[model samples]
Target chain A: TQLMGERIRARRKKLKIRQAALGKMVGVSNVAISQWERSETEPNGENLLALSKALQCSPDYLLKGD
Target chain B: TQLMGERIRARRKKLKIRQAALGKMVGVSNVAISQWERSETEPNGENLLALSKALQCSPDYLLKGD
Candidate 1:
C-alpha cells in the first residue's frame, strides 16, 4: 500500500496534475486520491487501471513501487 | 478482460495448478475462476491482489497481457 501510494504521488507530480484532477480522471473524489497517496486506502481493480492510464504509467510501476 | 483472462490461464497453467486449487488459494469459488478465465467476470480489488500473490505474478501482467 505504501509503495502504491508513493508511485501514485510520484507519477501525478511528474505529470503536474493535482489530486483532484487525477481523481476526476478516474471518476473518484479528491479525497480518494488523498487517501490513496496517504496509504489510507487503495483504489479498486477497475480504478487502478483507470489510474494507470491517467498517469501514463504501468500498474506494475505503481504496485511495485518503481 | 480478454487479455486478463488469457494471462491468468497462462500463469495458472505454468504453475500447474488447477482452477479449484487456485480458487482455494485466492478465496474464490472454482466457478469464479472459470468465469474469470473465460473473461465472463473479473475479481474485485482485494481478490486481484490475492490472485496476484497466489499466481506469483504482477497485476500489471494480468491486466496488460504482457
Candidate 2:
C-alpha cells in the first residue's frame, strides 16, 4: 500500500472502523479490504466511491499524492 | 450525464478531446466513453483515476459537486 492503499488504511483506521465493517459498508468482502490495505488488489471505480464515503475522505485525497 | 458524467463530458470537451482519444488514453473503447458520457455506465475506481488525469481534473471534481 504505497499511495492509495496507504491512504485507505490510514483513513479507515483513523475512523476506528474495521476492514470487515468497512467492506460491508462498501459491499465488498473483508478480504478485499485487507487486500486493498496490503496493495494486493485495488478498488474499482464504484468501490472507490463507496470507500471514500465509508472512509469519510475525499476521493482526491484517497487517489493520489498530487 | 448527471454529476460525474457531466463533469467528464464538460472536461473532455473543454480540452477538445474526443471519446475515442480519451478512451485510448484510459484503456477503454470509445463506446465505453460514450456510455460514460450518457451515464449508461460509470467509471470504476481505476478508470476514475485515469479520467481525472486525462481530463486534467481532480477526482473530487470528477466524482461529485464541490
Candidate 3:
C-alpha cells in the first residue's frame, strides 16, 4: 500500500500535474487525491481506471509495480 | 467490464462460493456482488482488495485480466 501511494505521487509528479488537476482528471476531489497519495484512502474501481489512463501506467503498475 | 464480470464469475465458481457468501467475505451485499459479477458497478479499491484476497488474484487481474 505504501508502494502504491508512492507510485501514485511519483507518477503524478512526473506528469507535471497538480493534485487538483489529477483529481479533476479522475473525477475526484483534491482532498481524495491527497488522501490517496498518503494512503489515507483508496480510489473506487472507476477512479482507479481513470487514474491508470491519466497516469499512463497499467493498473498493475500502479498497484503491484512492473 | 464484461470481461471483468466473466472473470469474477469464473473465479467464484472455482472457489465454490455463492454470491451471498462472496459478499460476506468482502463485506459487501450479495446484490453488490451480483452487480460486480454483472459489471453494473465496479467495486471500491478496498472491496477490490478483499476480492483479490478472497479469490486469489491480483486486483489488476480482476480489472484487466493480466
Candidate 4:
C-alpha cells in the first residue's frame, strides 16, 4: 500500500495532474484516488494499469516503486 | 490479449514454472492459466497481482510487455 501510494502520488504530481482527473481517466472516483494516494487501499490490477497509462508509466513501477 | 499471452508464457517458461503451479499460486485454475496463456481471457486485478508475485515480474510486463 505504501509503495503504491507513494509511486502514484509521485507520478501524478510529476505529471502535473489532478487526483480527480486521474480518477476519471482510470474510471474511478476521486475518493478512490485519494485512498490510493494515501495508501488506504490499493487499486485493482486494471485500475493500476489505467493509472499507469494516465501517468505514462508502468504498473510495476506503481506497484513496486521501481 | 496476444501480448498478455506471449508475455505470460514467456515469463512462466523462463521461471521454469508449470501453468498449474502458477495457477495454484495465483488462486486460479489450470484452465484459467491456459486461457490466459492462449489470450482467451485476462486475469482480474487480484489475480494479476498474485500472478506477478508468483512469477516475480511486473503486471505491466505481463500486460504490456514492458
Number of the top lDDT candidate: 3
Off by over 4 Å in 1: B1-18, B24-42, B45-66
The better candidate by lDDT, 3 or 4, is: 3
Error of 1 at A2 (Å): 5.6
Model 3, span B1-66: residue lDDT tens = 347888888999999999999999989999998998988888886688778888999777888897
Candidate 2: Cα lDDT at B40 = 78
| Chain B TM-score, one value per candidate, order as shown | 0.92, 0.89, 0.93, 0.90
Ten contiguous residues with the weakest lDDT in model 4 chain A: A57-66
What lDDT tens digits, residue by residue, belong to model 4 across residues A1-66? 356788889888997989898889999999999999898888876787788789998766777766
* Model 1 docking tier (incorrect/acceptable/medium/high): acceptable
| RMSD of candidate 3 to true structure, Å | 4.6
On TM-score, the leading prediction is: 2
Highest DockQ among the candidates is held by which one? 2
By TM-score rank, best first, the candidates go: 2, 3, 1, 4
The residue pairs in collision within model 1 are: none
For model 1, residues B1-66, the per-residue Cα lDDT tens digits are 357888899889999989999999999999999998888988766678779889998776787754
Which is better, 1 or 2, measured by TM-score?
2
- Measured against the native two-chain assembly using Cα atoms, what DockQ does each of the candidate structures obtain, in the order listed? 0.34, 0.47, 0.40, 0.36
Better of 1 and 2 by lDDT: 1
lDDT tens per residue, model 3, A1-66: 346888999999999999999989989899988998898876787687778888998776777786
Error of 4 at A32 (Å): 0.7
User: Which 10 residues in a row give candidate 2 chain A its minimum summed lDDT?
Assistant: A57-66
